[PDB]
């Protein structure tokens, strides 16, 4: 369901409904879960670090605008496509302090 939402539904929500008068919205880009610290340094966020530091495991959405831009952060379901843990092996999970 979540993969369906990311890989298809999101683009439909952005493109097929919104256009202003001009600025037309283009493709939507979903990053990997990151965090913009108070230090200013933005870095990759891993689930364990997210739960320990009471952070939000979310990626950033970036849309192309005509006549690119950050529009917000979408919470990522664990072991989904945009999650680091989906491609991770057992040893990788053990290293990431995530239970296999």
């Amino acid at each position: 369901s979540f993969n369906q939402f990311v890989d298809y539904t999101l683009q439909d929500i952005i493109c097929e409904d919104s256009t202003l008068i001009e600025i037309s919205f283009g493709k939507i880009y979903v990053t990997k879960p990151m965090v913009n610290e108070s230090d200013g340094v933005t870095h990759a966020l891993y689930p364990q670090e997210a739960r320990l530091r009471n952070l939000t495991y979310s990626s950033g959405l970036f849309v192309d605008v005509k006549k690119k831009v950050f529009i917000g952060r979408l919470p990522i379901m664990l072991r989904s496509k945009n999650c680091y843990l989906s491609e991770a092996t057992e040893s990788d999970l053990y290293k990431l302090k995530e239970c296999p």
Partner: protein
Amino acid sequence: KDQDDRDHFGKKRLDLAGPLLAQLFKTLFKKLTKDIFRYMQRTLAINAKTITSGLKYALATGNWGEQKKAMSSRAGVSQVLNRYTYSS
């Protein structure tokens, strides 16, 4: 032909994370493009906190549909993952 069975599971649907986040994101994004329309007509400075805080709020409280208590989805759509037993 007799009356339709309203308890028939085949004539029922289950909305998972997809459709829910889809409705919610549609709302928050329409709100965002509305706000952007306002900033445009006032005259790059796009309030990204709308979508972020919206999704985060609805995912935290379980109250689907931003901050409006007129919602009928107050039955806690999102809950804390029960971790007492693996089977749980």
